[PDB]
Write a protein that binds this ligand. Structure first.
Ligand SMILES: [Zn+2]
Ligand SMILES: [Zn+2]
Ligand SMILES: [Zn+2]
Lengths: 311, 82, 134, 310
């Protein structure tokens, strides 16, 4: 692979893979979404569609599960979440390829994070924004993609933020198919894990400590066979925090949180963290143009493996 | 020469009227095409019959081969082709 | 299995899931690939429970499992339909078909593949008001 | 006239083609059935399978319609009809390529002719032996083709023929799906056309006259679309009688019989008569060592053609 230059007229905010790794959707502040495809010939990225989605900066994007179709969901500063289903009959690079499904204009504040649930929960979607409440949108009938019902409206804050311009929200789902449903909320300076009990409603399970500044990213780790789970949080202060989550079977399981590691190696501000599919290597991108990879050592302590510079 | 009779007849025999002799000729030629293992030519004959049965309004008059798939939906236990 | 699905390794994932000791790994609906059909002549559902009962009794009274290979959904027990015929060769069709979607016609792999690639045709072999291209 | 040796140790009795014409099945007095195939590359008749079928001389075999599979019936003098289905997952020339389906033990007499019905009537069958009884067997169970139920049981002859007198029985169906179900049945010297009535039972519909001696072969001409049905008959006389049948109590439609032509060219016994695909060529074999081909020129009257000596 080689780096490719986008057609974006401003900063690219959130970039999210599809399931198969052959498509890249880049949402940007210029009111545009550009979906790329990985051609088998010549091994270079070619643009597939580029259309205007919102009336402001799109700050989050997520692909749906491949069994439900080619669905992306975009959250922006227009207090809306708009879904897009790909129509393959239209020509590429035309602007009419991706058709809007539904607009979930229910947040009084600008929405910061959108995340799809794991595929074994059904087509379930999450929203977090400036209003300060977590919204869950389910398609109880996945037959029609235009019928979205709000199924959970949980207040993640004691009070809404007065300083609306200085805030940042993030969400991360738990990909464990057979553990109970867990969702991570990083509202302003906390981090709360939410579980679904027998009541069918979200409850506070555990709180990640520390986090002296705003949380710019959160990422649950896919634990393939491990007896613990990892949560990576990037902060405005610049500290990577990796939390060792242990689960033992009203909630059906109690969670204990142990701060496994803390890393302030980004001399500045951390904007994104993301695990790989093993849950072993963790990426971390800062405002200095540097990307660091963290792998756990022989002890229970992560260390930096490489630094990627974009000179 | 039932072959030439059938290919001449299918231009206007189901489209404008209906008679049993043309049906006999069509069935006989289709059976002979099956017996010579010319299945592709039999299928071309069938699509030519279906193309030439279009009236001025557009309604088909050919006795096309009926449906063989009636999938039962798993969510509602009902026929998807009614 | 999700990691195997992320690559284009689906037969390997099928091999892994076929002999998995845990029965509820992917999906909880059981048979998600089951295709039940209604009869093309009488309209009742093709379940063929009488034939399955008779063949199970015959295989219990005998000592072979090849009698149960006579069970299939290509025939109807309610209306005594004999067999399903291929849309190209008009031969009996028992073990693998190839459904043409807009018109609902069966066919072998070889017959359908020959008609749609070797002859470069675009319509159904049975004759249908439309194009079932490629 | 290229010859190929079939490999039987005794007299080859019945040779029949299939629907597609690329397979022949030969039965003989060595109690064997041999199926031969015609390769498109070698262009020579090669053996596909040979297996022992009956305990007596097999004298009549017939292929089923290819829409019901690969089924070969077989009539022999041991009063049985055996049905043979082919499983393609077996080796050629091994004896296990054709699997037995059923034994029809209802016949109290050595069977002479078996003909499958046309495909539009179902998977039916016909039997005729030296007891005067015409038996029809249907495969009414679609799950397994091993339960063949007897449907019709007529009595062509009043009493069975004696032990020391020769007898011949031939069968011929009507291959027309636009006419009621008919069956040309030959007794010793009587030729009967049957019909399926409204009550579901076979009835005597017409009788072909003449036939001063034994009838060796009956062949219904294939319905190409003409308004008249043709029946060819080879007799123990030198007569090749061609009957013109035109169709218009408890029968769907009455039908008349007119003797179109009668030829004495063989000066012997016409052992077999057969038609083409279109019913335009009549092949007759007699005791003069000659096989004569017959065609209709300038009128409906049949005239002779190429004579093939052997
Ligand atoms: Zn039925
Ligand atoms: Zn076929
Ligand atoms: Zn069709």
């Amino acid at each position: 692979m080689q780096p490719f230059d986008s057609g974006h007229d401003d900063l690219v905010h959130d970039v999210v893979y599809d399931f198969y790794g052959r498509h890249v959707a880049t949402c940007s502040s210029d009111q545009h979404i550009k979906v790329f495809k990985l051609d088998k010939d010549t091994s270079n990225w070619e643009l597939s569609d580029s259309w205007r989605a919102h009336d402001s900066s799109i700050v989050a994007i997520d692909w749906a599960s491949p069994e439900y179709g080619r669905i992306i969901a975009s959250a922006s500063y227009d207090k809306t979440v708009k879904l897009w289903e790909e129509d393959p009959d239209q020509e590429e690079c035309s602007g009419r390829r991706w058709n809007k499904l539904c607009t979930l204009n229910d947040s009084k504040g600008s929405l910061y994070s959108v995340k799809f649930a794991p595929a074994h929960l059904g087509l379930k979607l999450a929203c977090l924004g400036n209003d300060g409440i977590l919204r869950l949108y389910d398609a109880l009938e996945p037959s029609d993609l235009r019928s979205w019902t709000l199924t959970s409206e949980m207040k993640v804050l004691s009070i809404p933020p007065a300083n609306h311009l200085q805030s940042d929200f993030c969400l991360s789902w738990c990909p464990s198919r057979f553990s109970p449903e867990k969702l991570a909320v990083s509202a302003l300076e906390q981090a709360i894990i939410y579980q679904r009990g027998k009541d069918g409603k979200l409850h506070v399970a555990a709180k990640l400590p520390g986090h002296k500044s705003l949380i710019r990213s959160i990422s649950w780790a896919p634990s393939i066979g491990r007896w613990y789970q990892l949560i990576a949080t990037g902060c405005k202060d610049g500290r990577i925090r990796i939390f060792k989550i242990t689960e033992k079977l009203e909630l059906q399981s109690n969670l204990q949180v142990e701060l496994l590691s803390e890393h302030d190696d980004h001399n500045g501000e951390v904007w994104s963290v993301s695990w790989n599919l093993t849950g072993t290597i963790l990426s971390s991108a800062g405002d200095d143009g540097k990307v660091r990879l963290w792998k756990a050592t022989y002890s229970n302590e992560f260390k930096c493996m490489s630094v990627i510079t974009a000179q | 020469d039932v072959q030439s009779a059938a290919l001449i007849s299918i231009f206007g025999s189901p489209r404008y009227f209906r008679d049993q002799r043309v049906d006999e000729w069509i069935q006989t030629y289709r059976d002979m095409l099956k017996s010579w293992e010319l299945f592709s030519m039999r299928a071309r004959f069938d699509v030519l019959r279906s193309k030439l049965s279009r009236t001025k309004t557009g309604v088909l008059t050919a006795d096309i081969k009926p449906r063989q798939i009636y999938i039962q939906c798993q969510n509602c236990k009902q026929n998807i082709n009614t | 299995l999700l990691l195997l699905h992320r690559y284009e390794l689906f037969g390997i994932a099928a091999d892994v899931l076929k002999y998995c000791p845990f029965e509820d790994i992917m999906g909880s609906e059981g048979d998600q690939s089951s295709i039940r059909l209604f009869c093309e002549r009488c309209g009742e559902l093709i379940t063929n429970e009488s034939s399955k009962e008779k063949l199970r009794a015959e295989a219990q009274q005998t000592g072979n499992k090849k009698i149960m290979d006579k069970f299939g959904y290509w025939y109807c027990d309610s209306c005594k339909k004999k067999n399903t015929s291929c849309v190209l060769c008009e031969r009996p069709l028992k073990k693998l078909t190839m459904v043409i979607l807009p018109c609902g016609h069966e066919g072998h792999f070889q017959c359908i593949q020959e008609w749609f690639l070797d002859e470069n045709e675009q319509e159904c072999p049975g004759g249908c008001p439309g194009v079932a291209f490629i």
